[PDB]
């Protein structure tokens, strides 16, 4: 696997190079229909970029096609959410879904179950900005989510996950952190991944409910990604 032969900077540059672009939304959304209309449309287009992003994550292509499917099915909403949280860092109390779609929690009230998840996303975003999360750290965390979130259903993913850990530490040492600050910051970042999982789970629960699927027509791709959780 090429992933393991990579140096830390190479691993970083590869992840930065794999980064998908920030997409624009296809009119301040209130009401259930207009909100979900905009969000599902954006999520669908992001999924196409996410799939091609995953191919360029070192180690991912070394997996069988079915394993690649399993990991993406498991992690897609987590990956959408950490991206959302990252973009929203410089906008406290607000979520930047797109440069032309900035929402506050007041618009989350339009949709059943959205506000609770809205607040969680806001808290996670605030946490990341308080830690001064860096872009290079962000792309490591996103790759970890992809490789970890469905890994326990293997030795290769284990080694790649270890390598990304090495890469995270390398970055922190590069930034001048002491050994204590390094392991403390490593821990803080990885603990947030648990909350990202939580947000994805609670989010998914509403999203694949029959009630939610009836709000607006969904793309076949988004429907399959939703039904993957059952």
């Amino acid at each position: 696997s090429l992933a393991l032969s990579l140096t830390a900077d190479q691993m970083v540059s590869a992840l930065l190079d794999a980064e998908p672009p920030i997409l624009y939304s296809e009119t301040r959304p209130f009401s259930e229909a207009s909100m979900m209309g905009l969000l599902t449309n954006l999520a669908d287009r992001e999924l196409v970029h996410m799939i091609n992003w995953a191919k360029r994550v070192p180690g991912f292509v070394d997996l069988t096609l079915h394993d690649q499917v399993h990991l993406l099915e498991c992690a897609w909403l987590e990956i959408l959410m950490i991206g959302l949280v990252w973009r929203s860092m410089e906008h406290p109390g607000k979520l930047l879904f797109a440069p032309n779609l900035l929402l506050d929690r007041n618009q989350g009230k339009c949709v059943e179950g959205m506000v609770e998840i809205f607040d969680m996303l806001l808290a996670t975003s605030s946490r990341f900005r308080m830690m001064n999360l860096q872009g290079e750290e962000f792309v490591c965390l996103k790759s970890i989510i992809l490789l970890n979130s469905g890994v326990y259903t293997k030795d290769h993913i284990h080694r790649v996950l270890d390598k990304i850990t090495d890469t995270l530490i390398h970055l922190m040492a590069k930034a001048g952190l002491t050994l204590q600050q390094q392991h403390q910051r490593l821990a803080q970042l990885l603990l947030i991944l648990s909350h990202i999982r939580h947000m994805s789970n609670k989010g998914m629960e509403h999203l694949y409910s029959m009630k939610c699927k009836n709000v607006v027509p969904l793309s076949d791709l988004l429907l399959e990604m939703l039904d993957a959780h059952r």
């Binding site: 091609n52 995953a54 191919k55 690649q68 499917v69 791709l221 990604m225």
Partner: peptide
């Protein structure tokens, strides 16, 4: 059968 199967191919 899955759309994901196709999209995962170059």
């Amino acid at each position: 059968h899955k759309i994901l199967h196709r999209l995962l191919q170059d």
